[PDB]
Amino acid sequence: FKNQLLLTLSSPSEAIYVRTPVRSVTVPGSEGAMTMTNGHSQTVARLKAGEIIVRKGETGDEVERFFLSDGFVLFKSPEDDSGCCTAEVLGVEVVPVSMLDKESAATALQELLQQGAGATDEWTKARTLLGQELLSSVIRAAP
Amino acid sequence: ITTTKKGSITSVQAVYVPADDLTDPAPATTFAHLDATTVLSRQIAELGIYPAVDPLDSTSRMLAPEIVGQEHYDTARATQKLLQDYKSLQDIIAILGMDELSEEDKLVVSRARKIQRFLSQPFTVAEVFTGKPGRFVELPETIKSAQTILRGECDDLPEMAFYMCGGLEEVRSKAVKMAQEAA
Amino acid sequence: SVKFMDQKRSGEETVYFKKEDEALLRNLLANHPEYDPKYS
Amino acid sequence: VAATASEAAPLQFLAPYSGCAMGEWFRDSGRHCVIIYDDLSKQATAYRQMSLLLRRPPGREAYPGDVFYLHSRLLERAAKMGDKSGGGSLTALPVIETQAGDVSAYIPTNVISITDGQIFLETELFYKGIRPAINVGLSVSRVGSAAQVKAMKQVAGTMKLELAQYREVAAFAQFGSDLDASTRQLLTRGTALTELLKQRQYSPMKNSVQVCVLYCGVKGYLDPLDPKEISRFESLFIDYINANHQDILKTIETEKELSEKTEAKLRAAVDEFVAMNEFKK
Amino acid sequence: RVGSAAQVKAMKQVAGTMKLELAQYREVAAFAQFGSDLDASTRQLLTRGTALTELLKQRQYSPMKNSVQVCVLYCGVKGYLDPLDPKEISRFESLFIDYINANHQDILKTIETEKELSEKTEAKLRAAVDEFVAMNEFKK
Amino acid sequence: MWRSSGVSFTRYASEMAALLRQCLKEPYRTQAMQRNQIHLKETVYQQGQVLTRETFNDIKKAFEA
Amino acid sequence: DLKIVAARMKSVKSIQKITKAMKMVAASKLRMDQRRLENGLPFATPVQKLVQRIPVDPKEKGTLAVLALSSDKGLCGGVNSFVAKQARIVIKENEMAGNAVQVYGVGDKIRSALQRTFGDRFKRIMTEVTRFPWNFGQACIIADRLMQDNPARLMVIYNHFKSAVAYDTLTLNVLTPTQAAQSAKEQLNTFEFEPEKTDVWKDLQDFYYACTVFGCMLDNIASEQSARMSAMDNASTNAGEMISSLTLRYNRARQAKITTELVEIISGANAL
């Protein structure tokens, strides 16, 4: 077909992209953020949180931002006959940044800190810390 | 048999209806001669709802807003509408089930069942059949209870608290007893 | 078909509203303590 | 004209013919009458009671063969005479009780064969609040729009189709939560019209008010309302127009037409009423 | 129409509960037979109704005394047949009858005379049923 | 944090997506919490002979119990 | 008689009407379920295709766990019948070799089907699930329950939704931790795992479990709705046939009643 990047960004409730040709796609891996393009090696990575940023071939400069909670990314090499290299971004909850709020975010942060102040269980402490992480990411990512 | 300007005769006639067929010539002709009507059914008596009066076949020349006020007329017509709405879901319930019915329809069915159980009451002469004591329910009490049940101020109560009562106090008492015996 | 549907309907309604009456009997005395004779 | 149960069978048998004789005076003299035979089946009954006692030969259900001829002699006097006889008329509204809704019996089949129409009342609708409990599916009129002013035609030609569509999509009312648009609008309009056609005992209306209310109904000014409020809506609208726009009613009553100017006045009055008032939904 | 007036108190005590249970079973069984899954309060209704329906069966020209009917319906109503298999009841009855005709004639004579069930006869009958279930064994 | 706390990645992902949905805007948040309600009825068995039956309407109690 | 035929005609006409209404409703639900499928299958296919590179042998010996997906409402054709048939086949095949079988289920129909025959093997059952749409009752919960009840080999039985008038029953041999530890995972060496393989495998496998259940249950739901529409069609047809027969019988009984009454009247008129 073409030497583009075939992105499919999918959540369970809605598939935002299916075979969208793009140039570069940034994703917040568990180690650190990284940008996948055509020619990139086969790889699997776990994401933690933050703002996926898609950049179509027609756009180049224009972008598209999407906040992801958690999930996986699968980059697969290009078949010899297809001529195009594929990528699958699976997210348990993939929102755009336009639909986010910083006030309900801080309210949930406060309620989480209230619930976790009685730190007794490991899962409770871990959930408090991870909620702090994700809500700070939401606050920093929202407009 | 009729009232005149010298006296009055209030008559009460029991009419055998063979094979539960209201189309027979004798009751068909007798229906036109009556001021008040009360038709008893077997499908209701099978449910233990005694008296087994069918409120969708019972009629009366008196049930008009000018004779009985609108608090009575609208209450009666709302009860009849509710019972007809409940009757118009029997096939849907028998085929599909209660899972398909919306919460409005479930509320309707619950209120209609509660009315059905509430119209029952024990008589003094049926002690030798039921053992329970008899009741005398006045009309303002009946209207208050029906208005309350239709308005929705007893949905918190159960359904088995109605089938032998003569008011809302007895309903609440029976529900109280069943809740205490539940634990 | 007639007795069939009638008895099926009656049984289903009986079970459903038995469950609902059980739940209401569980949750009555809490939300309406003025009626509980335990507190009278 | 009263031929009660104490009155003998011949008197119950003769009272309808006496009424027709009393109405022929109005018919022949250029006037108009409407005669109302209540319990014609007690007439036929009386005739049977007189034939089985005169030892006449019976038929099915023991009725003699002169029953169709009887009701025919009775009902064929109802007529509309020409301008050379005087222009009078004699309308007829015979009443019949069906014992199970079966209109295939002898007397029902004889009378529907004799009559120019049918108004079929039902018991399932009398308790659903639909009073008069007229089932417009089985109710027909072989005369039709020829017996209607244009002001009523303009709304009835629409409402008949709308109610037929509601009757085609009635069973879906218990599943409309799962359906899509283009099928819930039909249910809504049908429900609104059915709640509009409800009426109170001994409270009839005029044709102008009928036209105004049915224009309010068919033109979508009741879809977004709670149905239970329509009985209020109608009443208030009636009072409003009878207080404010008697000119519209007089024009509709005089011209027997709903012109575009009167329709604009009507939409104006409806908008003013809706603005002045507040409803639930 | 006469009803309980033509009925002994000892038989009233059991037959009222029996009629109620059979009414409930007749109500519920038609819906239950579709293979649905029901709670235990309804499974108990079905079990007791099946037990009573299998109790009320009888052979031809094999009538029974009133005291024996009372005892059998007591065994059926107080729950000594719910866990037992239905097909076994047809012998649970017979054996129980022989047992109470052999070793417990006094209970039958007392019920025949007094025409009621005092607490003493209640306890004696319960003890006899317990002894019988101990001495015997069935499929459940 | 989860293999140490004795927690699954699916549980963590769901319980964090819950918070992310709580951090939504009301028009889309309505449809999100709509499409992500819970209703389950667990029924535990041991060679027949049901040990327990329990309902679940919350993610946290569903993963906990 | 007449009352019998009239009551039967009334009941069957009501049945036909409600059947057609439920047919249209099921068509709408099938539309929405196809929509949920087209949106939600890409979320599940990639990780499943990834983990399926590790070939699972269905002859392995060990504690088998059979997850049978089914519905809670009736009139679904015979999809749950075919599911329970495949489950019985699998159980009877794997219990001969000596593999101890456990049974997980979704829906009351599989429970009612396998209570009497394999009720001494149930482990955990879920129901009242699809009252709402599917991912209401998230597959993550069931996957967590499976992992907490970690078996040695897992099978999943469901109905694949080929087209609106065609489905297909399938069995998925699913990988488990014992089977992953027993393999060096040389097939994934072509992939660069951003965290190390040993650290990301445990989090990837739960995602694999969740995605497997998700697509399987979506396909089962679609097949259920298709079978429901087909069953409503057949029921309406049978109701029409019964209405025709009862109409014939009704007219016959009407004529018989008329003739009998008339002969009675005539004989009473001539017996004077």
TrEMBL record, chain A:
A GO term for molecular function: proton-transporting ATP synthase activity, rotational mechanism
Tagged with keyword rRNA processing: no
GO CC, any one term: proton-transporting ATP synthase complex
Keywords: Hydrogen ion transport, Ion transport, Membrane, Mitochondrion, Mitochondrion inner membrane, Transit peptide, Transport
Ranges where the ATP synthase F1 complex delta/epsilon subunit N-terminal domain occurs: 7-75
Subcellular location: Mitochondrion inner membrane
Family: Belongs to the ATPase epsilon chain family.
This protein's name: Putative ATP synthase
Source organism per UniProt: Toxoplasma gondii (strain ATCC 50853 / GT1)
Classification of source organism: Eukaryota, Sar, Alveolata, Apicomplexa, Conoidasida
Residues of the full protein shown: 41 to 183 of 183
UniProtKB/TrEMBL annotation, chain C:
Top-level taxon of origin: Eukaryota
Name of the featured protein: Uncharacterized protein
Portion of the full-length sequence here: 57 to 96 of 145
Automatic annotation (TrEMBL), chain E:
Residues reported to bind ATP: 58, 60
UniProt subcellular location: Membrane
Domain ATP synthase alpha subunit C-terminal, first and last residues per copy: 7-114
Function as written in the Swiss-Prot or TrEMBL entry: Produces ATP from ADP in the presence of a proton gradient across the membrane.
Family assignment from sequence similarity: Belongs to the ATPase alpha/beta chains family.
Protein name from the UniProt record: ATP synthase subunit alpha
Lineage, opening ranks: Eukaryota, Sar, Alveolata, Apicomplexa, Conoidasida
From TrEMBL, chain G:
Pfam families hit by this protein: ATP-synt (PF00231)
GO MF entries: proton-transporting ATP synthase activity, rotational mechanism
InterPro entries: ATP_synth_F1_ATPase_gsu (IPR035968), ATP_synth_F1_gsu (IPR000131), ATP_synth_F1_gsu_CS (IPR023632)
Topology class, membrane: Peripheral membrane protein
Predominant cellular place of this UniProt entry's protein: membrane
Keyword Phosphoprotein (UniProt): no
Location in or out of the cell: Membrane
A GO cellular-component term linked to this record: mitochondrion
Alphabetical keyword list: ATP synthesis, CF(1), Hydrogen ion transport, Ion transport, Membrane, Transport
CDD domains: F1-ATPase_gamma (cd12151)
Domain of life: Eukaryota
Family: Belongs to the ATPase gamma chain family.
NCBIfam families, per database record: ATPsyn_F1gamma
UniProt xrefs under PANTHER family: ATP SYNTHASE GAMMA CHAIN, ATP SYNTHASE SUBUNIT GAMMA, MITOCHONDRIAL
UniProt-recorded name of the protein: ATP synthase subunit gamma, mitochondrial
Organism name: Toxoplasma gondii (strain ATCC 50853 / GT1)
